[PDB]
Every structure is written in structure tokens, then in C-alpha cells.
Design an enzyme around this catalytic site. Structure first.
Site, PDB file in Angstrom:
ATOM      1  N   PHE A   1       1.259   3.516   4.716  1.00  0.00           N
ATOM      2  CA  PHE A   1       0.513   3.563   3.429  1.00  0.00           C
ATOM      3  C   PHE A   1      -0.945   2.814   3.699  1.00  0.00           C
ATOM      4  CE2 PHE A   1       3.511   2.849  -0.304  1.00  0.00           C
ATOM      5  CZ  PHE A   1       4.514   3.860   0.046  1.00  0.00           C
TER       6      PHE A   1
ATOM      7  N   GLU B   1       1.172  -8.271  -2.528  1.00  0.00           N
ATOM      8  CA  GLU B   1       2.333  -9.234  -3.189  1.00  0.00           C
ATOM      9  C   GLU B   1       1.727 -10.149  -4.015  1.00  0.00           C
ATOM     10  OE1 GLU B   1       1.924  -7.676  -0.089  1.00  0.00           O
ATOM     11  OE2 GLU B   1       3.164  -6.440  -0.863  1.00  0.00           O
TER      12      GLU B   1
ATOM     13  N   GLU C   1      -4.535   2.697   1.507  1.00  0.00           N
ATOM     14  CA  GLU C   1      -5.370   1.768   1.734  1.00  0.00           C
ATOM     15  C   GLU C   1      -6.858   2.066   2.256  1.00  0.00           C
ATOM     16  OE1 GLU C   1      -2.389  -0.934   3.113  1.00  0.00           O
ATOM     17  OE2 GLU C   1      -1.584  -1.866   1.276  1.00  0.00           O
TER      18      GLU C   1
HETATM   19  N1  LIG Z   1       5.790  -4.909  -0.999  1.00  0.00           N
HETATM   20  C1  LIG Z   1       6.422  -3.653  -1.214  1.00  0.00           C
HETATM   21  O1  LIG Z   1       7.329  -3.415  -2.091  1.00  0.00           O
HETATM   22  C2  LIG Z   1       6.154  -2.563  -0.114  1.00  0.00           C
HETATM   23  C3  LIG Z   1       6.641  -1.320  -0.421  1.00  0.00           C
HETATM   24  C4  LIG Z   1       6.522  -0.314   0.602  1.00  0.00           C
HETATM   25  C5  LIG Z   1       5.588  -0.533   1.746  1.00  0.00           C
HETATM   26  N2  LIG Z   1       5.133  -1.733   1.850  1.00  0.00           N
HETATM   27  C6  LIG Z   1       5.467  -2.676   1.086  1.00  0.00           C
END
Ligand SMILES: NC(=O)c1cccnc1
Ligand SMILES: NC(=O)c1cccnc1
Ligand SMILES: NC(=O)c1cccnc1
Ligand SMILES: NC(=O)c1cccnc1
Lengths: 251, 251
Positions: B174, B98, B179
Site C-alpha cells: 500500500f 489509524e 503512499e
Molecule cells: N488499518 C487498516 O485497516 C489497514 C488495511 C490494509 C492495509 N494496511 C492497514
């Protein structure tokens, strides 16, 4: 000091980002659109000399950009920017000026006018000290005033109680000059949080020194008053950045 | 689910804001300009059906938006968004997806294509579950891949060790999907931080369960491996939001 590049774009970008996605649940959207907010903001200092401003220069801008604040979440701070904002937690616990539209938009930006076209300087801006106060603090001062004026219910103030050179409360901190004096009768109480930086001689304490003066001053404006020194929620925050600190020893 | 309004503007606004002012000291600026980044991002899903995407759809976008990442501070997380980001402290301690350009730009945004002009739907977007995974996770999946691929040195992973229904490490989180498998030989170590939510039965522990599997898996990819449960810096952060918690009792 060097001015922010592409002021217009940064402003509009930040504005739009805010509008559509920022504190959707904590703060109301503002009525005016970004272009309108830009005009109000630009006319305030454009084509005037950098030092040609007063508390009224951004009046129109702040009127258009002022959002109603949620009762009890407004927070003010002095000399503890990082600690105050971390605790406020981006509008989650308390909102700060920096969390409102005007604050979010201009936070950290540098700009100033010039009389020659385009109307603002993009090479350089005068130093703080060069201009008279009313111009120097024309924007953030007004911002603070408008913000404070909108506070409802309980209001919170975080101060540094470990600064030998600067008392927790000062009649001429932005708080003392524009925030406290502009709290309306919509405000109920003023809760103070005194921050005692870790591993630092304590300088101010509740019911003493400037805190004692503030208390009188506050009850004078007819508000209830609270004061706490390093409340646990906050202490723990301080401890995070300095775990070894003696004041963080775990049971 | 309802799509984000004025996607274009929000994207460009966020983009410009980042470019000029966001992690100036933590992350490099990207080479492409915002309009270019927009085109790469738009072609990826525009004029196709909402469910018409795969891991490659945003390849061009991510190539243009990928910033080089600070050695030893990249952080990954699973099911602890708030705790991970608070600890990462906006790039100050660790950077997270982010905090990067692509993540900052699209964080929380909702969009999808449609075949009819303008090329994207502005009324509604299909639900997660409706589309095949490769489309469903086309963007954030790719983002995560590109991000991870850019990690260098020590890498940090924060996981929830208090979730009875979801093991700390999962081959198909994820992290486990995009990752971990994409960490390059530029990565040195994988330090894990297990979070034990306050006042909650501990579910996972280092050297046990999925953490034990991850450890093997990591050493397999030839990386050193660390693991800590509620390190004090983090514990204190948890304590801030819940001071009374038994695990926060002060000495
Ligand atoms: N920050 C995000 O948009 C996101 C989306 C899916 C899984 N983890 C984070
Ligand atoms: N942008 C700023 O530097 C700033 C400083 C103090 C208060 N509000 C904003
Ligand atoms: N020169 C400046 O950066 C500035 C910022 C805010 C208000 N007035 C002047
Ligand atoms: N904007 C979205 O709806 C979306 C869905 C899945 C992955 N990335 C973005």
C-alpha cells in the site's frame, strides 16, 4: 474546570464503540445496553448539586457496567499512569481500569450535576477540592472499588518509587482506599512493580518503607506477595523515551 | 467474513468520540459533522454490489474527513503494524493513518454494500480475493492516498527488514502503491526505519536490496533520504516484549 461537551453523545458513542469493537478478546461484553447504562450513570448525579454524591451514587451504574476480569491480568497503579498503561499495552499484557467499559467510557471526561433542568452543568464544574471526598471520589473511587472487587488470581500493582513527596504505597491513594481493601478471596497474589524513574534518586525499595508496610498488609489479607524494581520489560520501556539515560547503556 | 454490527452507530459513535475528545492536541478537528461524514461514507458503497467500487467511491468521504497533518511527523509503515504504532505512540511521537479521523473511525471495521434495501449487507461480506483490486482496496487505498497527499515536511517509514518472503520496500505494498507516489512537494525528506525482528536472520539492510531501490526512488522524487536499522528508541521497544533476546543484553 470545564465539563465535557455533549456528555450524553460522547458516553453513548464510546459505549457503542466499546461494545461492538474494543476488547472483544480480552474482556466480556456487558449485558445492559448503552441507553440503560446511560440512565444508571445519569441518575447518579443528575438534578443533585455538584457536591451531592457519595460512594453509593454510581452503585447501580457500576453494577450494570462491571465486566468479569480475566484471571491474572488485572493491574493497579499509582502515580505512574503513562508507564503503567504502556506496559499494560491496552489489555494485551494486563488490563487496567481504563481498559474496562466504565473506565473507557468516562476516562478523562468532566461532568457534574446541577439541580436546575437539564440536571447537569454544561458551563462549569466545581474544583476537586471544593467537594467532600465521598462526592469528589464518588465515581472513580467506586469504579476502582468495583474493579478491584472483580480481580481474580494474581493482581499487579505498579508504583512510583522515585517520588520523595509520595510514598510508593499510601493508605489513602485510590489504591489504598478502594482497590487493595476490596480485593476478594478470589485474588491469589499481589505482585508489585516498583518504578525507578530514570536518572532519579531512588526513593522506595522492596522490603523497605511503604513497600515493607504493604507487604505485611498484603500477607495480612492472606495473599502471596512479590516485588520487583524496574523489571527489564519495564526498564526497556522507560529507556525508549530516554535512550541516553545511564541505566540504558547497551552491553 | 462477517460485517461489523450496527455499522452506523459504531461509525457515529467513534466519530463523535474523536471529535470531542481524541487527538485534541495532535490533530485538527474536521469541519463536517458526523451525520455529514456518514452520508459521504454511506453513498460510497450503499446499494451497489459488494464488489462495485473503485478508488473514487470514497473520494467525497475522504475529502470531508481529511485533516491537515503535523509537519514532520507523519509515519508510514509496512508489515510492522504493532511495532510502528507502539513507536508512534498514539500521535505522541508520530501520527499514523489509524490516528486520523477516517482511520480511527473505520479501523478494523467490516462492511460492504448490497443492492437490496437497506443497501448494505449485515450477514456477510465477500472475501478480499473475490473482488477486483480497485474495489477491494477502494477504501483503505483511498484513505492511504488522501493521507499521504497531506503529509508535510519529514516523513517516516518503518519497514520489516527480517522477512525473507517480503522485501522491506515493494512497489506494490500500500505504501508503494498509494503512499510514496502521492507524497507532495511539501514533503522534505523520507526517513526510513528498518526493523530487524529480534533473534531473526537479518534480510534487508540500508543501501541494499529494496532499500537501495527506494533510496533511488526517493531521491528521484527529489526528497532527502535517511535510513537506520533498529534505532535504539525502537530496539528498546522490541526488547520489552522479549527481554532475553540476545540483542537486548544489558551492559
Ligand atoms: N488499518 C487498516 O485497516 C489497514 C488495511 C490494509 C492495509 N494496511 C492497514
Ligand atoms: N479520568 C481520569 O482523570 C482518571 C484519573 C485517575 C484514575 N482513573 C481515571
Ligand atoms: N468533575 C469531574 O470531572 C468528576 C469526574 C469523575 C467523578 N466525579 C467528578
Ligand atoms: N469493510 C470491508 O470489508 C473493507 C474491505 C476492503 C477495503 N476497505 C473495507
Amino acid at each position: 474546570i470545564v465539563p465535557t461537551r455533549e456528555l450524553e453523545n460522547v458516553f453513548l458513542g464510546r459505549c457503542k464503540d466499546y461494545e461492538i469493537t474494543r476488547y472483544l478478546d480480552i474482556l466480556p461484553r456487558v449485558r445492559s445496553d448503552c441507553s440503560a447504562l446511560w440512565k444508571d450513570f445519569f441518575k447518579a448525579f443528575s438534578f443533585k448539586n455538584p457536591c451531592d454524591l457519595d460512594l453509593g451514587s454510581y452503585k447501580d451504574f457500576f453494577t450494570s457496567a462491571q465486566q468479569q476480569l480475566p484471571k491474572n491480568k488485572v493491574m493497579f497503579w499509582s502515580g505512574v499512569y503513562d508507564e503503567a498503561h504502556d506496559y499494560a499495552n491496552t489489555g494485551r499484557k494486563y488490563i487496567t481500569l481504563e481498559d474496562t467499559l466504565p473506565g473507557y467510557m468516562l476516562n478523562s471526561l468532566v461532568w457534574c450535576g446541577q439541580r436546575a433542568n437539564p440536571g447537569f452543568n454544561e458551563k462549569v464544574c466545581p474544583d476537586f477540592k471544593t467537594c467532600p471526598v465521598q462526592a469528589r471520589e464518588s465515581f472513580w473511587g467506586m469504579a476502582s472499588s468495583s474493579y478491584a472487587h472483580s480481580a481474580e488470581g494474581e493482581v499487579t500493582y505498579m508504583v512510583d518509587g522515585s517520588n520523595p513527596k509520595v510514598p510508593a504505597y499510601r493508605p489513602d491513594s485510590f489504591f489504598g482506599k478502594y482497590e487493595l481493601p476490596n480485593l476478594t478471596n478470589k485474588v491469589t497474589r499481589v505482585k508489585v512493580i516498583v518504578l525507578h524513574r530514570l536518572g532519579e534518586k531512588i526513593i522506595e525499595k522492596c522490603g523497605a518503607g511503604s513497600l515493607l508496610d504493604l507487604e505485611k498488609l498484603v500477607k495480612a489479607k492472606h495473599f502471596a506477595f512479590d516485588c520487583v524494581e524496574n523489571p527489564r520489560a519495564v526498564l526497556f520501556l522507560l529507556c525508549s523515551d530516554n535512550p541516553n539515560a545511564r541505566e540504558c547503556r547497551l552491553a
